[PDB]
């Protein structure tokens, strides 16, 4: 008979995939029953059938986890690379901690800035910066936030900077919050699934099962719009091509089509958006430029981008929508230039295909039909990234799809925990809970609070950010405890104050000028992931010291080592001291991570880490306690802010995940009473809602949107009830979502002004005569139907913005601008303004930009389903599935260059080159754009110089060092290259 | 002598364990007039035992072992939050789940460890 079942007596542990943001459940199997004498070893991993999103399924990345956990390239011991050396030397943990602390202290004491030139206390340290791990837990993230900020760091970013920064920059201004609005299983309710700006069948495969459920079992139409015919196109009902960098034209064309045919949800638009508000008379737009442009600073004065004010100080309105200055009529005028011929001329999308998409989208303007948009980097990674997103969001507000089951904006996050690190604020000027560090002009608490607490711009609105001071003071009580009191303004002056944002491109520009001494890379591989790799390696080489913390060997850790054409450097010329510290991976600790749907999910430890690897919090605590002890005995600069940060863990060298998770939830520091004199919480108890946070020092929380995650009822992130009573796929008992377990944001819009569902088969919330109740937790207060209170409760006007007032850097309405490296060399809509007029482009990077005479083809970079960044090439299973680097090109271009399928080619740009196998296919086809034939060369990003797959070249050797005008997110998706036979 | 078991020829372990823990024989109130236990309920601490005939316990140091919260001797939480190997959630120790006797001496006269 068959071999026996190999897991019958193994230890079974629950955990969550460590790669993308779907958050699939895992069941991991270890050799050993947990007895103290058996050292557990994970030997198989499969899916958890009870998880509501994955239901047992795992894509090739999650299914291959065993080979990542047990990779031959797992890091085992602390290693050190001496200046000008060509080899690693093994050191002890205590030597690593003491050498790093000494280097840090010397640099901090030399360059710490206590006061700025205007006399304000700013306590900031700029010569050492940090990259944080979006693949590590939320408890690691909060420890990293405390470590960084208590030292005064401002150059602190996580992957959000090169990823979904633009989403937050456009979705927050439009709807009030920057996160994905619905959740994976909810996509099954859609009537139309649009995959544009994303490739969900390859980038989020197990979450995409729900789009296949809507197509196959809800009769939905799946549409893919992309320069390439991808694996998501394989299963699509409609495929339409589009030139990289032209989404705003296509989407603005869709707005013009909807308005012109009156394919809108008119009552939704009239009440839930700002359509009826009146805009200042001085607002204008002409020939590519909005009013207020200052051509020398390349920035706009946004004074005119605002509403007209009434007598009470509120925005003026015209409910009939006939006034020439209402948002609705200015929107109509703005998009009138984007006709179907203009879309075809700029995007290259055939009019017949563009028409099919417009007609299907238009069918969801009915109240009981919805479109859901699934997108990610195809829209964010541009110099107009944020504006791409604004256009789509506007479409969803015209169709009335926000707040509906099967509707919304599913901005699919990337890393497993990029949503938690964004929530915890590991971004230059951020604090946890979407709070902001003080700017250096805000000289006291009162100024700071006033700048961050918005006044309502229409009467009768929830305007929930009016509670900013309760969140802020609670954060300060979490950080400083008894040291933060009313008398010292809750420790206000201990936080670093910023003079500007220290985004990654800027900070590498400072590193190139010799202003950066040290850098930490915690679970981030910038040699692979940052634009213009040859410049990145040059900038890192000027560092005096680098600390890498990771479970695997990365290209970044070996940037000083010669790897031939892949990394042609001279070790003897690089003086950086490099510390490589071996950390745990997802399977070797307990903790939480937040998926794309905002679900905070707990996971448990299945084995110890290999060798002398330690957990991320233990590595930060080693360095931190050595450093703070040096300050205790030698003194130095910025002593107080550093020494006042709390580190209240039972074992200070080993902070536990539950202690940190509980601090994020928050506690009552005194007994708390409601207005009726009823006890709401006792001193010492975990809080059950952010509604109980106060601004008087009686409450603490290091992450206000996380209040409710771990209460007196227990760890809600460990809840495993997959019940779905409505049949809509909403499982309120599985894990815990922020905010307050609301799974579908903006769900008051799922009903009309009288409280009646737009679609009676999809009721989310309903009015019972005194409260809202239903199949989801209401994202709303208790305003009764018929009152003026808008459903977007974080917006000061309570509405979805069609016109984004003064929030966007380049305009309150989106406008087409070409990529910095464009194949046309001009912009057919307005040749006087080719590219975004507010883009920041450093002079050194401007010299490294190419033109179409030398680099005639559009270059774009993207992912393949089988690999995750340059991480899974260290896993044998994934290396077998896609072993060797390739690039994709059309049959037409291959014939022109005499390239046969499978031949080697050389792909180059103004910054460098890569060599690879050529995949020649009809899936890529030239498009007719502005009288030219434009070809695209496709460059997957998974290969490099470390790993078990065949050695290749970093794709970022080709990409430009320029980014979105709002978040500085690099333009990785549209640039210019040349190709030659090799 | 009492032999108050549901089957007198086969006294059950839980009946005897509950007698060792002890019971409130009348409703019991603290000095502030707050109910501490109802008549018939298992006591939660020997602090609630009285000398007036309103409480019973056949083993006062065992009060807390099996309360209204259940059999504490069956608790199986091996958590050790301090790292010192103290597992207050595994089984139940006398007296009142104190695992290290004389632990006020683990600090000096001012309370410092
Ligand atoms: N398989 C796999 N999964 C991933 C990842 C991975 O490494 N491997 N990474 C995770 C991360 S961190 C992220 S943020 C996500 C992103 O996930 P996605 O953004 O979906 O994935 P990409 O492949 O980067 O890009 C999507 C598509 O953009 C198309 N495209 C190129 N330029 C343009 C253009 O300007 N407009 C339009 N409309 N489309 C364009 C590309 O051809 C590609 O099909 O993936 C996550 N999931
Ligand atoms: N050309 C081009 N460039 C891109 C993009 C693109 O489409 N085009 N996409 C961009 C985006 S959206 C992103 S997110 C990036 C990502 O690029 P990166 O995030 O730098 O790349 P990864 O290879 O995903 O690196 C993650 C590291 O985390 C380590 N990690 C795993 N778990 C832990 C842990 O528990 N703790 C620690 N300390 N380490 C851990 C892994 O070993 C791995 O080394 O690439 C970006 N760059
Ligand atoms: S990579 Fe994403 S889709 Fe694949 S198993 Fe992991 S979490 Fe699921
Ligand atoms: Mo990403």
Swiss-Prot record, chain A:
CDD domains with a match to the protein in the record: MopB_CT_Formate-Dh-Na-like (cd02792), MopB_Formate-Dh-Na-like (cd02752)
According to its UniProt entry, one GO biological process term is: formate oxidation
Q: Which InterPro entries match?
A: Asp_de-COase-like_dom_sf (IPR009010), Formate-DH-alph_fdnG (IPR006443), MoPterin_dinucl-bd_dom (IPR006657), Mopterin_OxRdtase (IPR006656), Mopterin_OxRdtase_4Fe-4S_dom (IPR006963), Mopterin_OxRdtase_prok_CS (IPR006655), MopterinOxRdtase_cofactor_BS (IPR027467), TAT_signal (IPR006311)
| Domain 4Fe-4S Mo/W bis-MGD-type: residue ranges | 10-73
Known cofactor(s)? Mo-bis(molybdopterin guanine dinucleotide); [4Fe-4S] cluster
Query: Could you tell me the keywords of this UniProt record?
Result: 4Fe-4S, Iron, Iron-sulfur, Metal-binding, Molybdenum, NAD, Oxidoreductase, Periplasm, Selenocysteine, Signal
Q: How is it modified after translation?
A: Exported by the Tat system. The position of the signal peptide cleavage has not been experimentally proven.
Q: Where does Mo-bis(molybdopterin guanine dinucleotide) bind?
A: 163
GO CC, sorted alphabetically, is:
formate dehydrogenase complex; membrane; outer membrane-bounded periplasmic space
Could you tell me what the cofactor note in this record states? Binds 1 molybdenum-bis(molybdopterin guanine dinucleotide) (Mo-bis-MGD) cofactor per subunit.
- Fetch the SUPFAM superfamilies from UniProt: ADC-like, Formate dehydrogenase/DMSO reductase, domains 1-3
The similarity annotation says:
Belongs to the prokaryotic molybdopterin-containing oxidoreductase family.
Q: Which PANTHER family match?
A: FORMATE DEHYDROGENASE, NITRATE-INDUCIBLE, MAJOR SUBUNIT, TUNGSTEN-CONTAINING FORMYLMETHANOFURAN DEHYDROGENASE 2 SUBUNIT B
Name of the protein: Formate dehydrogenase, nitrate-inducible, major subunit
Q: Which organism is it from?
A: Escherichia coli (strain K12)
Q: Which gene encodes it?
A: fdnG
